[PDB]
Design a protein around this ligand. Sequence first.
Ligand SMILES: [Cl-]
Ligand SMILES: [Cl-]
Lengths: 231, 231
Amino acid sequence: PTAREENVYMAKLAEQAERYEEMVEFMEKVSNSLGSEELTVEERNLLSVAYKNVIGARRASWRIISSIEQKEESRGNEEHVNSIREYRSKIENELSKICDGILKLLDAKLIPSAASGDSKVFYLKMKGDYHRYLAEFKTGAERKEAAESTLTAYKAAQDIATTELAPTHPIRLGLALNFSVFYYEILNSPDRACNLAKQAFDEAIAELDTLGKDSTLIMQLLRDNLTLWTS
Amino acid sequence: PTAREENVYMAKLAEQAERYEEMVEFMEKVSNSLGSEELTVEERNLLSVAYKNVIGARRASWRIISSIEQKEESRGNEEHVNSIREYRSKIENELSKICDGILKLLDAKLIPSAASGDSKVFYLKMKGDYHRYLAEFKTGAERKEAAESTLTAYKAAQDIATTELAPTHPIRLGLALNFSVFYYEILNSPDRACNLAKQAFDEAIAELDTLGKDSTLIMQLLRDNLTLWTS
Ligand SMILES: [Cl-]
Ligand SMILES: [Cl-]
């Protein structure tokens, strides 16, 4: 009944109880426990689901408070806008601590332990993902650097994915989705976004057509975003 | 742009962002701010929605971890049961801190400030509600005392409601729902539960039939639970 084994189970209990911050803490220990070896596919995904839910909540709050702010500033009410933005600052604070936690873990333990193509792309995609969440709310040179780190991480992830994983591989397809969402939402470049998404979609269909749920959903998402961006 | 006014708005922003712990903190200040006067109907409900969501999450987690525990102990796996129960203890810890926070606030500021029948019943019902949440997981003499405080609070709430508020009043109907749920779930007495729920339902319909959404839902709930308890 090892510690690592104990933490993984605890993480799954946290997942069932929807106490994601705690789920993160447990998978954080697991990650910091091993040294030479890599996290299992299950462990790697538990950690990823944990952080996704932790940051997802704050991202949703942010979008809502951000929208209130937009409506109130255009309505002229300034006392309200100050309170809104003060509330947003607090949301942005957690977003920064959260991204910082997983990004540090990626460079210190996860990326260095990646021994296969699945592993490396997954972790590099995750790295791009969290620098992308920072860019969603940053503005000055901060946004610039967050945007830069995002592009660097995704390009690296794609170089490995494009050559080592199948076109229909869910991690590769997810990387394409996120990478293209990055061009569209952050770099406000729907041109580069559609080209990338279309290419990934086409390669997947080609493969599916010649030599055959995750891939199906991702591909539908790519499709939805593809048309949605053609307006 | 007063502080109280500022906190109430902040609470509403927290509600939109679904940061309930924070929503509680803001309404906690509002409550502790006034002295002679009472919370508005809006304020009183913001505080109530805040705590409901804060405790609701833990109650849902508890029910889930509690179920895992039940399945694993009957399966014989003891190492798992220890981890489950350890996780539950942590959930129960928050449940106790949460109830304790609102119960203290009720006896110190809220109950003492209640100047009308709406006010008094609302706060006494809330008091019964939180002693009831404690009883849901307690077991020894702890459960006994939690159950006792619950019954005392509800009886007091009902004496006021039965004589000062209309049978169709949502707070009175909610008190009946919760009070009857208490007899059934905590006191495992479906007899006393149905009698109470039926009486409240009948009085409401009588009133509705002679001298005319919240009341409609509550009444449906009373109905659903009424039949559901007839098995
Ligand atoms: Cl989201
Ligand atoms: Cl619940």
